[PDB]
Amino acid sequence: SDHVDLPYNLTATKIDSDVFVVTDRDFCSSNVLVAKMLDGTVVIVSSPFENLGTQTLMDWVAKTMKPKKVVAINTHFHLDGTGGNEIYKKMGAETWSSDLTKQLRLEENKKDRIKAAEFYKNEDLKRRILSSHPVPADNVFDLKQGKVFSFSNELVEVSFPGPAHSPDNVVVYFPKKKLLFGGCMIKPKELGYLGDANVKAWPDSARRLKKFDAKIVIPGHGEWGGPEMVNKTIKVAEKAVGEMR
Ligand SMILES: [Zn+2]
Ligand SMILES: [Zn+2]
Ligand SMILES: [Zn+2]
């Protein structure tokens, strides 16, 4: 079948033999891409919110893919992005983000934990959030220049299309699979949490994603789709600009 149910309400859904989406349903249905490169390297894009979810994800990756190496790419500084870094590191993964994402995560870490913890209503989820201590990635590239990974000539392209959902949001493109992980700047129905959003910039940042020849676009939350995901996002952001003036 199309998915496997994992502990802590994680879902792992197959897109093909070498591409999976793992969804943290407990924490806002956050999507994590897991792509196995031909040379055995596993690339993970984004993260579950915290340690229990991330440990569950890594246990499943270990069991099912037995990777030679794991490379984890943070999409932005939010917990669906950096929440996995502690456990990724502990498990021997190489964690990556832009320099801005690291900076924003470090700044976010200075803020009051217990006050920001009442943002969730369930007490078990609160205790899971408070039990984790998010850290930035170990390896950093310059936001504006992006980064292209080459795993035995299999390319993974990380680029900054401009501020949208957050000032630092990047997308990850896999040209071999024509797959774009757009992350939380892909919002085909409604923009969602705007705490760090640049609504005025969002339509043009999303327009810049049209350059990718994507057959599959994976959003940070919710069902994935095709290139129309980008078009839907642009209109949703425009309506927000329209009301906002
Ligand atoms: Zn199921
Ligand atoms: Zn976010
Ligand atoms: Zn998100």
Author numbering: 31 to 92, 95 to 220, 224 to 247, 250 to 261, 290 to 310
Which lines from the publication concern this structure?
SPM‐1 is a particular challenge from an inhibition perspective because it has a broad substrate specificity (catalyzing penicillin, cephalosporin, and carbapenem hydrolysis) and has properties characteristic of both B1‐ and B2‐subfamily MBLs. SPM‐1 has unusual second‐sphere residues, and is unique amongst B1 MBLs with respect to mobile active‐site regions; SPM‐1 has an extended “α3 region” (residues 223–241, BBL numbering) and a relatively short L3 loop (residues 61–66, BBL numbering), which are features characteristic of B2 MBLs.8a No structures of SPM‐1 complexed with substrates/inhibitors have been solved, though structures in which the α3 region adopts open8a and closed8b conformations with respect to the active site have been reported.
Residues in the L3 loop (Y58) and α3 region (F151) were selected for modification and labeling with 19F. Selective labeling of Y58C and F151C SPM‐1 variants using BTFA (Y58C* and F151C*, respectively) was confirmed by intact‐protein and trypsin‐digest mass spectrometry. Notably, the naturally present cysteine (Cys221) in SPM‐1 was not observed to react with BTFA, likely because it chelates ZnII, as evidenced by S‐carbamidomethylation of Cys221, but not Cys58 and Cys151, in MS analyses of Y58C* and F151C*. The circular dichroism spectra of wildtype (wt) SPM‐1, Y58C*, and F151C* were similar, thus implying similar overall folds as supported by crystallographic analyses of Y58C. The combined biophysical and kinetic studies established that the properties of Y58C* and F151C* are sufficiently similar to those of wt SPM‐1 to justify PrOF NMR studies.
